[PDB]
């Protein structure tokens, strides 16, 4: 499948899906093209103009070979507060931007818990957070709880 992406400001590029044909593959290609994370891509099917739903087959939302989607990028970087439960079980808020890395969150927690950053690890909904990836790739929300655990040695 070759789809057209039309950025609202006006410019057009083309992506190829050949793997899964999901919203993920599409967004991955747009990342390769214009360097913005999946969570920053607001996509809509043309011509209806409705949103593309994440976690739904593209062919289910009326998208086939040669169709075009409309792309708005929303750097989704307005600060929000999240909860961090630490390894002693106590919770406190932390101000973050979904555009920051997990590594940057670990630096904030390191500074306040007094533990070197490589001596602990973080999880959201049980999924271990990778240092290089932005918080928004994990779907964090106002007052989500990241759990901290020690890499006890």
């Amino acid at each position, epitope marked *: 499948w070759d789809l057209t992406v039309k950025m609202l400001a006006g410019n057009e590029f083309q992506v190829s899906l050949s793997s899964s044909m999901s919203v993920s593959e599409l967004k991955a290609q747009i990342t390769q093209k214009i360097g913005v994370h999946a969570f920053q891509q607001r996509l809509a099917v043309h011509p209806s103009g409705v949103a593309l739903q994440d976690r739904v087959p593209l062919a289910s939302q009326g998208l086939g070979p040669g169709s075009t989607v409309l792309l708005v990028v929303d750097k989704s970087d307005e*600060p929000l507060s999240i909860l961090v439960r630490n390894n002693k079980g106590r919770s*406190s808020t932390y*101000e973050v931007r979904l555009t920051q890395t997990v590594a*940057h969150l670990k630096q904030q927690v390191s*500074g306040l818990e007094g533990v070197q950053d490589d001596l602990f690890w973080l999880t959201f909904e049980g999924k271990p957070l990778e240092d290089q990836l932005p918080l928004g790739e994990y779907g964090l929300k106002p007052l989500s709880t990241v759990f901290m655990n020690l890499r006890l040695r």
Partner: nanobody, 120 residues
Framework: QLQLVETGGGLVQAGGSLRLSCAASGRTFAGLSVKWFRQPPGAEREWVAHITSTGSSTHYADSVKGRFTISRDYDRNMVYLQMSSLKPEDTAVYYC?????????????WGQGIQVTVSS
């Protein structure tokens, strides 16, 4: 560079009020996330309050919610902790703390730490 200067501590009777202050003396508080912590006698340092960098959220630990108020006077580089209905259990050394925010390089700043003794 930034230093955080704390004032306002001291001795209060149970049921009284205190306004702690945290002056931003190096640069302004712009773009910094600011928290108060306290350390009760022979206890872990515990989190108390939080005002975010845009000054538009506040968060409190359960032990102080309803009694304590965090706020900022932005024109004057000030973050306050308003403590009312103080109990003897609020006796602790109080610290204010500031964090930068992505995409700024992460740094932590800490006030010196002031004593609050609540007496009955």
């Amino acid at each position: 560079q930034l230093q955080l200067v704390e004032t306002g501590g001291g001795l209060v009777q149970a049921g009284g009020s205190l306004r702690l202050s945290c002056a931003a003396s190096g640069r302004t508080f712009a773009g910094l996330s600011v928290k108060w912590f306290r350390q009760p006698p022979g206890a872990e340092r515990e989190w108390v309050a939080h005002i975010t960098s845009t000054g538009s959220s506040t968060h409190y630990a359960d032990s102080v919610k309803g009694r304590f108020t965090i706020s900022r006077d932005y024109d004057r580089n000030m973050v306050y902790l308003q403590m009312s209905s103080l109990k003897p259990e609020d006796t602790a050394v109080y610290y204010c703390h500031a964090s930068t925010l992505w995409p700024e390089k992460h740094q932590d700043y800490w006030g010196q730490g002031i004593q609050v003794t609540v007496s009955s």
